[PDB]
Amino acid sequence: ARYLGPKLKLSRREGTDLFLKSGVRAIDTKCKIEQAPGQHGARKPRLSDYGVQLREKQKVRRIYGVLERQFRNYYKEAARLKGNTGENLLALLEGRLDNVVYRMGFGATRAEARQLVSHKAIMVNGRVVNIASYQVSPNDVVSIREKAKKQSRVKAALELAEQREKPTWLEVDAGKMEGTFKRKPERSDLSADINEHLIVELYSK
Amino acid sequence: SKEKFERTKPHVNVGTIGHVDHGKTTLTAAITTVLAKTYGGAARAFDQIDNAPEEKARGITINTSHVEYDTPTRHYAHVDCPGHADYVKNMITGAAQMDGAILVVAATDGPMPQTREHILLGRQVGVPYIIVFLNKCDMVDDEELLELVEMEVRELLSQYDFPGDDTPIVRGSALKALEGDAEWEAKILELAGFLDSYIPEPERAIDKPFLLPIEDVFSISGRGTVVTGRVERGIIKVGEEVEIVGIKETQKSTCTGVEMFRKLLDEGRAGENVGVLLRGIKREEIERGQVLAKPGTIKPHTKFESEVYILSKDEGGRHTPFFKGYRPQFYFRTTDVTGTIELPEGVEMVMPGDNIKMVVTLIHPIAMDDGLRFAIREGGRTVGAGVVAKVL
Amino acid sequence: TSYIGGEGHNLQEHSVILIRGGRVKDLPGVRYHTVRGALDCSGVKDRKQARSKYGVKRPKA
Amino acid sequence: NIKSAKKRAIQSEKARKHNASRRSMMRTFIKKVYAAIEAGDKAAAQKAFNEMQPIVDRQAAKGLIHKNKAARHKANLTAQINKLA
Amino acid sequence: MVTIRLARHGAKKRPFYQVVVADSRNARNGRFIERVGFFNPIASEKEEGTRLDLDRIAHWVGQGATISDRVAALIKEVNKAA
RNA sequence: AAUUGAAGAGUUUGAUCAUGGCUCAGAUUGAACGCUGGCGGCAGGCCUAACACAUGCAAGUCGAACGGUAACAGGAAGAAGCUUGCUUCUUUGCUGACGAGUGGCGGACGGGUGAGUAAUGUCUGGGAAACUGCCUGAUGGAGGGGGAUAACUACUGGAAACGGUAGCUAAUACCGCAUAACGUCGCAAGACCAAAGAGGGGGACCUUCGGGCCUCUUGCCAUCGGAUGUGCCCAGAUGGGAUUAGCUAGUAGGUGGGGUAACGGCUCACCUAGGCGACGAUCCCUAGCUGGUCUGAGAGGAUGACCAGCCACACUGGAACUGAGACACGGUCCAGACUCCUACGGGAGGCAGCAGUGGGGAAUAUUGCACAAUGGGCGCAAGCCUGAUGCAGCCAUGCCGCGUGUAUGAAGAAGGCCUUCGGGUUGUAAAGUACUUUCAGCGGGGAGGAAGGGAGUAAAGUUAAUACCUUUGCUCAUUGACGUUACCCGCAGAAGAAGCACCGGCUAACUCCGUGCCAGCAGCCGCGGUAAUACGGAGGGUGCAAGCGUUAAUCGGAAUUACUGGGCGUAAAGCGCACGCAGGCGGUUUGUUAAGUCAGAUGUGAAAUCCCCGGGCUCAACCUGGGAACUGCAUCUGAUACUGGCAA
RNA sequence: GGGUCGUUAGCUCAGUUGGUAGAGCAGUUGACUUUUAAUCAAUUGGUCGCAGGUUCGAAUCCUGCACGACCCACCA
Ligand SMILES: Nc1nc2c(ncn2[C@@H]2O[C@H](COP(=O)(O)OP(=O)(O)CP(=O)(O)O)[C@@H](O)[C@H]2O)c(=O)[nH]1
Ligand SMILES: *C(=O)[C@@H](N)CCCC[NH3+]
Ligand SMILES: [Mg+2]
């Protein structure tokens, strides 16, 4: 399921970091970023048209950790919907459960918010959900299982989370670990740099 | 399978052995019919035991067989052994089962070539008890001759290392014993007493992991593939999966059903000379001479170092010594696996009739328990007697 | 008439082997390929880099 | 095979025995009329008609003969003697 | 013998019962003259878990269509309109 | 709200642009193989041998149909011990209950497989010359006798299988007689056609003390309809081949007899000499068909595994009986092969039902459990049977989920590696340090799938009756195969869990040494002839993931079978030319008709499945509700421009 | 389980009183060559299936196994 590997090298192959290794050290700087992915990193990235569409997938997929078999169904799930594909695609890519915890502030890193959900710390509408795939519907509330509430892993990540952008399509309380998922996202507020134009076209073939 | 076997008196894994044409097979039939008057349920004649059609026209034992006989005192698992020289691998397989052997030596013939071979192969096969019986005593009438033949028994057993000191020697005639001469028949019954008295029960290691050395494979229509041999250790009932460790790459399957002479068993303990059916395994998918222990407990080793007692011709084996590049057959409880022998760095070659250890390889993997006395022989005669000093 | 895939084999003009479809476009007359490591045709020694092909098992280590 | 429900067989055995005799005698009544028609003894055949009717119709109501089957013999044969009558 | 019975649809450990109007001779899950409403014994608490148009059912029982035990109880659940 | 949808690349040449093949990039599967591997969820699991199959099991039930009891639980007349009711223990079908027998209904279904067959089949829409136990609406009757046999006895055939002779005996078994009609025959008159009785409770009358008798439950028989299912008929659609052109004899039709439930050369007898066929009859080959399935933008191509409908078969060829229904998977008989028994005369037998073996093959499952739920059979019911169904197992075979951890960490280690041996990379990667603990592991609590059935008791109808029976309430007793459940909780500790293919372009990602047209790669072009980015191995990166890849099969891309949607001067391709039958097509004007056409309405287009919109499974897959569709066909009533028939 | 027969340079094969293993094509090394063929020169190659025993000495006769292809039994 998970890559379970060095999640800093993924941002050297891409060059543009996608919040992989937050933890304590805010900015990487310990990787000689942008040009060294291995023994022959000095090679020129000629990158053909196939590559620019493939790395766009490497960009999105490496964000939420969604594997291809699963990720591919999301595309079919996107096109079957009404109208704009990549837009309905990101809507799916935001509803994901372990992603919400990352957004609520309880998880500094994705792997944290992933194992945080995996380690029984979710109570949505009075229901515990161990599975990280749970696409959260709008107008849904959640909190943290009392025995795993305000624990060591959450505090370090939560206090550090007040320095962020703090998204708008949701909001938490963090005084008793009370979260509420608001409306569905819109392309204007989110990412704004990922050209979903490509991936949809890559999945056209 | 028919009508569950009532596990009564303890069975003792025995079997008659001896020289070719000494009347061993007909003696067994004679034993069964006479015991059929102490414990009635028996009538296995000569045709009942020399069942094989190949054996039928000629009158010889070539296949390792089994018959069920018992005295009201104790139960018994019998093995009719092939008395020939070119079929001794069948005899080692036939004697591997044993704990108490019945040496059939003609009181008229003395220590014969195969007799000396069956005693030498009765030695390295691992039999600890040799109850000697003088068959064909009706042909000889002078008792003075018998005094020498009895001393000759003392000769071949003590020849190396055996209990041939208080050997119970009964004088009966197998043919007369089977056909109806009551006097020779009671003499077989003296042996019946010796079969129960001279032989104490063999302690069964049932608390240890299950083990089952493979004798031969059958394919009884209706249930699947049957595998026979003796239960070396522990107990099992239908359900426990087993790892078929043998000369090939290991396989795993669940044992189902255990019978004994068409007599159904729920569970089979250590020592049980029984048959085993498996879960979805072909007749081809199982060979003659493998191991059936519990899953994931044995590594099929080929490398090892082992002390051995090579035999001189005057001792019953090799005429001359051997260099590094000698490859005899090794009998690990059941079958043959030729291992090219190489002696350690101190030896180029060493003489027969001595004790020495060396590292040898095997062309076919097997359990290889480091400390088990294994059998070795080449070209017809017993060339060695060793013990696996260590395993690799 | 198939092809022997890999460096060195131990076939003995007998010993039933398995076959998969594939023509080695270097020999005008071969349309089949043999399944290495399968039932009789043993795999090649010292193999690494994709041992699925060549039917060789992963080293004992 | 040997099933306990083979009782239906031995029953039908016992059934076909009389069922044979019932239809056998039934058609002879009909055979009586064909002997008559070939000659022309209509009155005797008519005496036999109201004679074979109560026996054939009886066969219909029992279960051996289907009502339309027995009525079929009452249909054509009436016209048969009527070809003469 | 045309009747009104269950069908036993669903899955492993998660059954479902398509109440129908099928023939006695045919296989349960198979052929049916026509069908009406459905029943979920494991709905237990939600928007809908028991539906049967008794009017058409009356046309059936009021024609000679027998009822199975549980389906008669399905009617017993409502009695007429309760 | 119900398809908002169509990508190209490599490859002929010194280079180009075509025509044109070949191959790949995608999706799919009842998959197998190689290497590798934690579990859980829902699904599937013999494609070949329709070859043979050992054993268990796969269809019974009713005493409330009849005589009866072979055993047990009781009473009962009784007898033995012996503490005189403490017990023994012979008789009694008097009872609960119930072998076997007889009779009824069932076994014609459920479940399996795809041999056959190119039309008797099937899908589709109509049609008339029919039948339909079980359920039910309405019309009535349900009178009264007779003569046997099974059971069981007595002798007894035969090894067994399996009977025979001679008698006992009832039935809701069978056979008449009475009575028949709205039923049959029939112009009519006339004539004929049926049956069954059991059980609960009980007041007077009644007691040969059998019971008649009264009531209720319920069944039997004849009738007309509904309902449901079956048979039949016609048209249309439904593979390939013309290197098959003729095929047909009861074959085409009439009349008359006969036949079936019913029409019919269905079958016969006589006469007539027709019938099918170039829009393809025959013969040969293949083959289950459709809803749907995989793909495809669509049109179509391929396909029909599971599931659902239908058809056919049940060791091989054939026949017939009973029965409402079969010309019958677990029925009979016949002949045969193939296995078995045997007292050698003669007998037994069909796993293409569920498991399992042999055999075959690339290849596919346990001789597991319960009838708890549902479905069917029988019964008043309780219950009894059910390898249908519902579960568990076994397999990464497929689709969905989570896991093998998270965070910090420069000393920028060791070792491997490239080296300009300056240094860079492997690499926050590792150890370390600080946190958490899914899933197994293991110890505890714990849903729901369960409706009803039973007694008790309560109330209203029915009835002579506060009886019984029927409809409706409450109590207690409980009834779960799965099941050491789903799930919640708790313990300990990163502790048990990442491989697999690629890396020259196609197409994502590159270097080192060894081998030198040798050893090999490979789907396509082509790499290897002493510095290999294509071989081998090393390093690193890359892509997918508990699988990843290979192989076969299908569609696609392939507008390379082009109807949508292609070409014929040289690229494959104008017959050498002409006359010409059917064939296909037709100027201009009007009238008419309305077949094609279009319109709208109706019926049907089974359901499920695809799609849209909800909900329930922790989400998902999945299940399920409603909606839309099924682009079709047929009928009705309309419009009539145009195409066609008819007239001028 | 058993009972017979087969195996020689790399390939195709020789080889019986038991006496130091040969025939080509390969191919190895040169030369001309970009690399080869070709052409002129030279030329190794089995440790006689694997082991053991007999013999003085074994491809040769006898034993045992491995690996096949042909034969009968294998039946809790
Ligand atoms: N005089 C005599 N003849 C006898 C006696 N016993 C046997 N014979 C005969 O000796 C022969 C060998 O019988 P068998 O029992 O096969 O011998 P074996 O010793 O098993 C032989 P193998 O070596 O093949 O296994 C038979 O002919 C038997 O009848 C005996 O006691 N006395
Ligand atoms: C079968 O159950 C065995 N006990 C029979 C004797 C050994 C096999 N021959
Ligand atoms: Mg013998």
Short mmCIF file of N, CA, C and O in Angstrom, two decimals, chain B residues 5 9-17 65-70 74-81 93-102 125-131 195-196 199-205 213 215 228-233 260-261 269-275:
data_model
loop_
_atom_site.label_atom_id
_atom_site.label_comp_id
_atom_site.label_asym_id
_atom_site.label_seq_id
_atom_site.Cartn_x
_atom_site.Cartn_y
_atom_site.Cartn_z
N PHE B 5 -10.29 -50.22 13.96
CA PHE B 5 -9.33 -51.06 14.67
C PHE B 5 -9.39 -50.81 16.18
O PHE B 5 -9.24 -49.67 16.63
N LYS B 9 -3.77 -54.86 22.84
CA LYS B 9 -2.42 -55.10 23.34
C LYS B 9 -1.39 -54.39 22.45
O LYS B 9 -1.59 -54.28 21.24
N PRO B 10 -0.29 -53.90 23.04
CA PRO B 10 0.76 -53.20 22.28
C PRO B 10 1.43 -54.02 21.18
O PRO B 10 1.93 -55.12 21.43
N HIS B 11 1.44 -53.47 19.97
CA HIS B 11 2.08 -54.17 18.86
C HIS B 11 3.59 -53.97 18.98
O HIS B 11 4.05 -52.94 19.49
N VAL B 12 4.34 -54.97 18.55
CA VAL B 12 5.80 -54.89 18.59
C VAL B 12 6.27 -55.11 17.16
O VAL B 12 6.08 -56.18 16.58
N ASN B 13 6.88 -54.07 16.59
CA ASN B 13 7.37 -54.09 15.21
C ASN B 13 8.47 -55.12 14.95
O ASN B 13 9.66 -54.82 15.09
N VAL B 14 8.07 -56.33 14.54
CA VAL B 14 9.04 -57.39 14.27
C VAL B 14 9.04 -57.85 12.81
O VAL B 14 8.34 -57.28 11.96
N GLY B 15 9.84 -58.87 12.52
CA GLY B 15 9.92 -59.40 11.17
C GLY B 15 10.97 -60.50 11.03
O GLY B 15 12.03 -60.44 11.66
N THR B 16 10.67 -61.51 10.22
CA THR B 16 11.60 -62.61 10.02
C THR B 16 12.61 -62.30 8.91
O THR B 16 12.25 -61.72 7.88
N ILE B 17 13.87 -62.66 9.14
CA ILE B 17 14.93 -62.45 8.17
C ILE B 17 15.83 -63.68 8.10
O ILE B 17 15.84 -64.50 9.01
N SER B 65 7.04 -57.09 2.38
CA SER B 65 5.62 -57.22 2.71
C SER B 65 5.33 -57.09 4.20
O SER B 65 6.23 -56.88 5.02
N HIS B 66 4.05 -57.23 4.54
CA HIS B 66 3.58 -57.12 5.92
C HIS B 66 2.37 -58.01 6.17
O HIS B 66 1.46 -58.10 5.34
N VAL B 67 2.38 -58.68 7.32
CA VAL B 67 1.27 -59.53 7.73
C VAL B 67 1.00 -59.18 9.19
O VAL B 67 1.90 -58.71 9.89
N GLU B 68 -0.23 -59.39 9.64
CA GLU B 68 -0.57 -59.06 11.02
C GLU B 68 -0.79 -60.30 11.87
O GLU B 68 -1.75 -61.03 11.67
N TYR B 69 0.13 -60.55 12.81
CA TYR B 69 -0.03 -61.68 13.70
C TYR B 69 0.10 -61.24 15.16
O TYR B 69 0.70 -60.19 15.44
N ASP B 70 -0.49 -62.00 16.07
CA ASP B 70 -0.45 -61.65 17.48
C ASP B 70 -0.82 -62.79 18.42
O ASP B 70 -1.61 -63.68 18.09
N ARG B 74 0.70 -60.11 23.60
CA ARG B 74 1.04 -58.89 22.88
C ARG B 74 0.74 -58.94 21.37
O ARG B 74 0.75 -60.02 20.76
N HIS B 75 0.49 -57.77 20.80
CA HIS B 75 0.19 -57.61 19.37
C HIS B 75 1.51 -57.50 18.60
O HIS B 75 2.56 -57.22 19.19
N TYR B 76 1.46 -57.72 17.29
CA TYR B 76 2.67 -57.65 16.47
C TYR B 76 2.50 -57.17 15.03
O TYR B 76 1.50 -57.49 14.36
N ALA B 77 3.49 -56.41 14.56
CA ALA B 77 3.52 -55.88 13.20
C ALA B 77 4.67 -56.64 12.52
O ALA B 77 5.84 -56.44 12.86
N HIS B 78 4.33 -57.51 11.58
CA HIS B 78 5.33 -58.32 10.88
C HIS B 78 5.77 -57.80 9.52
O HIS B 78 5.03 -57.11 8.82
N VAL B 79 7.01 -58.15 9.16
CA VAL B 79 7.60 -57.77 7.88
C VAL B 79 8.25 -59.01 7.27
O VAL B 79 9.18 -59.57 7.85
N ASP B 80 7.75 -59.45 6.12
CA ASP B 80 8.34 -60.60 5.45
C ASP B 80 9.49 -59.98 4.65
O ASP B 80 9.25 -59.11 3.80
N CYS B 81 10.72 -60.41 4.92
CA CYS B 81 11.87 -59.83 4.23
C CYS B 81 12.44 -60.64 3.06
O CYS B 81 12.54 -61.87 3.12
N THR B 93 15.03 -52.04 4.13
CA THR B 93 13.77 -51.32 4.26
C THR B 93 12.87 -52.20 5.14
O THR B 93 12.11 -51.71 5.97
N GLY B 94 13.00 -53.51 4.95
CA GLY B 94 12.21 -54.46 5.71
C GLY B 94 12.63 -54.53 7.17
O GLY B 94 11.80 -54.77 8.06
N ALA B 95 13.91 -54.31 7.44
CA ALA B 95 14.43 -54.37 8.81
C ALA B 95 14.48 -53.01 9.49
O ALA B 95 14.73 -52.92 10.70
N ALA B 96 14.25 -51.94 8.72
CA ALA B 96 14.27 -50.60 9.28
C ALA B 96 13.11 -50.45 10.26
O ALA B 96 13.21 -49.77 11.28
N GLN B 97 12.01 -51.12 9.92
CA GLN B 97 10.78 -51.10 10.72
C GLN B 97 10.96 -51.73 12.12
O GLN B 97 10.41 -51.24 13.11
N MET B 98 11.75 -52.80 12.17
CA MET B 98 11.99 -53.58 13.39
C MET B 98 12.51 -52.98 14.71
O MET B 98 13.05 -51.87 14.77
N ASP B 99 12.31 -53.77 15.77
CA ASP B 99 12.75 -53.49 17.13
C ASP B 99 13.16 -54.87 17.69
O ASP B 99 13.93 -54.97 18.65
N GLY B 100 12.65 -55.91 17.03
CA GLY B 100 12.94 -57.29 17.39
C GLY B 100 12.85 -58.11 16.12
O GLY B 100 11.79 -58.19 15.50
N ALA B 101 13.97 -58.72 15.71
CA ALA B 101 14.00 -59.52 14.50
C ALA B 101 13.99 -61.03 14.77
O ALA B 101 14.43 -61.49 15.83
N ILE B 102 13.48 -61.79 13.80
CA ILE B 102 13.42 -63.25 13.91
C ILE B 102 14.34 -63.85 12.84
O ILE B 102 13.94 -64.01 11.69
N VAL B 125 21.45 -52.23 10.12
CA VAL B 125 20.09 -51.77 9.89
C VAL B 125 19.55 -51.22 11.21
O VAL B 125 18.61 -50.41 11.22
N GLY B 126 20.14 -51.66 12.32
CA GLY B 126 19.73 -51.16 13.62
C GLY B 126 18.92 -52.07 14.52
O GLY B 126 18.40 -51.61 15.54
N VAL B 127 18.79 -53.34 14.15
CA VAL B 127 18.02 -54.27 14.98
C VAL B 127 18.80 -54.56 16.26
O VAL B 127 19.97 -54.97 16.21
N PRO B 128 18.18 -54.35 17.43
CA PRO B 128 18.85 -54.60 18.71
C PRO B 128 18.64 -56.02 19.28
O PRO B 128 19.41 -56.46 20.14
N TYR B 129 17.61 -56.71 18.80
CA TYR B 129 17.32 -58.06 19.27
C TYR B 129 17.27 -59.07 18.13
O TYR B 129 16.51 -58.90 17.17
N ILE B 130 18.06 -60.14 18.25
CA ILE B 130 18.07 -61.18 17.23
C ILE B 130 17.65 -62.53 17.83
O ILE B 130 18.46 -63.25 18.42
N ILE B 131 16.36 -62.85 17.70
CA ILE B 131 15.85 -64.13 18.19
C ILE B 131 16.11 -65.13 17.07
O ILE B 131 15.51 -65.04 15.99
N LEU B 195 9.09 -64.51 21.61
CA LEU B 195 8.78 -63.29 20.88
C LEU B 195 8.18 -62.26 21.85
O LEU B 195 8.32 -61.05 21.65
N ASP B 196 7.53 -62.76 22.89
CA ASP B 196 6.91 -61.91 23.91
C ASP B 196 7.77 -61.72 25.16
O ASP B 196 7.74 -60.66 25.79
N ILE B 199 11.59 -60.17 24.22
CA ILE B 199 11.42 -58.81 23.71
C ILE B 199 10.52 -57.93 24.58
O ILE B 199 9.31 -58.18 24.71
N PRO B 200 11.10 -56.91 25.22
CA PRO B 200 10.32 -56.00 26.07
C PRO B 200 9.78 -54.88 25.16
O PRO B 200 10.31 -54.67 24.07
N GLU B 201 8.75 -54.17 25.62
CA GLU B 201 8.16 -53.10 24.82
C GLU B 201 9.12 -51.97 24.45
O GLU B 201 9.96 -51.55 25.26
N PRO B 202 9.03 -51.47 23.20
CA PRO B 202 9.92 -50.38 22.79
C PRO B 202 9.31 -49.03 23.20
O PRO B 202 8.17 -48.72 22.83
N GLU B 203 10.04 -48.24 23.98
CA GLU B 203 9.54 -46.94 24.42
C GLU B 203 9.22 -46.05 23.22
O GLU B 203 10.04 -45.89 22.31
N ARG B 204 8.02 -45.47 23.22
CA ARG B 204 7.59 -44.62 22.11
C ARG B 204 7.68 -43.12 22.42
O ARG B 204 7.07 -42.63 23.37
N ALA B 205 8.46 -42.41 21.60
CA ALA B 205 8.64 -40.97 21.76
C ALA B 205 7.46 -40.21 21.15
O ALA B 205 7.55 -39.70 20.03
N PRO B 213 8.95 -42.23 8.66
CA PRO B 213 9.81 -42.67 7.54
C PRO B 213 8.99 -43.46 6.51
O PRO B 213 8.31 -44.43 6.84
N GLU B 215 8.06 -46.03 3.72
CA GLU B 215 8.43 -47.36 3.24
C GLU B 215 8.09 -47.50 1.76
O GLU B 215 8.98 -47.67 0.93
N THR B 228 2.95 -45.76 3.14
CA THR B 228 3.23 -46.60 4.30
C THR B 228 4.64 -46.48 4.86
O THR B 228 5.54 -45.93 4.22
N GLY B 229 4.80 -47.02 6.06
CA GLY B 229 6.07 -47.01 6.76
C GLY B 229 5.77 -47.11 8.25
O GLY B 229 4.69 -47.59 8.62
N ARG B 230 6.70 -46.68 9.10
CA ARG B 230 6.46 -46.72 10.53
C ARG B 230 6.48 -45.32 11.13
O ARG B 230 7.11 -44.41 10.58
N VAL B 231 5.77 -45.14 12.24
CA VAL B 231 5.72 -43.85 12.91
C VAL B 231 6.94 -43.74 13.81
O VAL B 231 7.00 -44.38 14.86
N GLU B 232 7.92 -42.94 13.40
CA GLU B 232 9.12 -42.78 14.20
C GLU B 232 8.81 -42.06 15.52
O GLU B 232 9.26 -42.49 16.58
N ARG B 233 8.02 -40.99 15.45
CA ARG B 233 7.67 -40.24 16.66
C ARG B 233 6.26 -39.64 16.67
O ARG B 233 5.56 -39.61 15.65
N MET B 260 -4.79 -49.93 9.39
CA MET B 260 -3.80 -50.96 9.69
C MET B 260 -4.44 -52.30 9.34
O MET B 260 -5.20 -52.86 10.13
N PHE B 261 -4.13 -52.80 8.14
CA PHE B 261 -4.69 -54.06 7.66
C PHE B 261 -6.20 -53.91 7.51
O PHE B 261 -6.98 -54.70 8.04
N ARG B 269 -0.29 -43.33 16.91
CA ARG B 269 0.84 -42.97 17.76
C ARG B 269 2.20 -43.42 17.21
O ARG B 269 2.30 -43.95 16.10
N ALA B 270 3.25 -43.20 18.00
CA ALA B 270 4.61 -43.57 17.62
C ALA B 270 4.81 -45.08 17.53
O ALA B 270 4.32 -45.83 18.39
N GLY B 271 5.52 -45.52 16.50
CA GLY B 271 5.79 -46.94 16.31
C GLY B 271 4.81 -47.65 15.39
O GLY B 271 5.15 -48.68 14.79
N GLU B 272 3.60 -47.11 15.28
CA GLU B 272 2.54 -47.69 14.45
C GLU B 272 2.90 -47.99 12.99
O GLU B 272 3.11 -47.07 12.19
N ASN B 273 2.97 -49.27 12.64
CA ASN B 273 3.27 -49.71 11.28
C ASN B 273 1.96 -49.55 10.50
O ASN B 273 1.25 -50.52 10.25
N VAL B 274 1.65 -48.31 10.11
CA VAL B 274 0.40 -48.03 9.41
C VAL B 274 0.53 -47.30 8.06
O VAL B 274 1.63 -46.99 7.60
N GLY B 275 -0.63 -47.05 7.45
CA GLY B 275 -0.68 -46.36 6.17
C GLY B 275 -1.28 -44.97 6.31
O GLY B 275 -2.11 -44.72 7.20
#
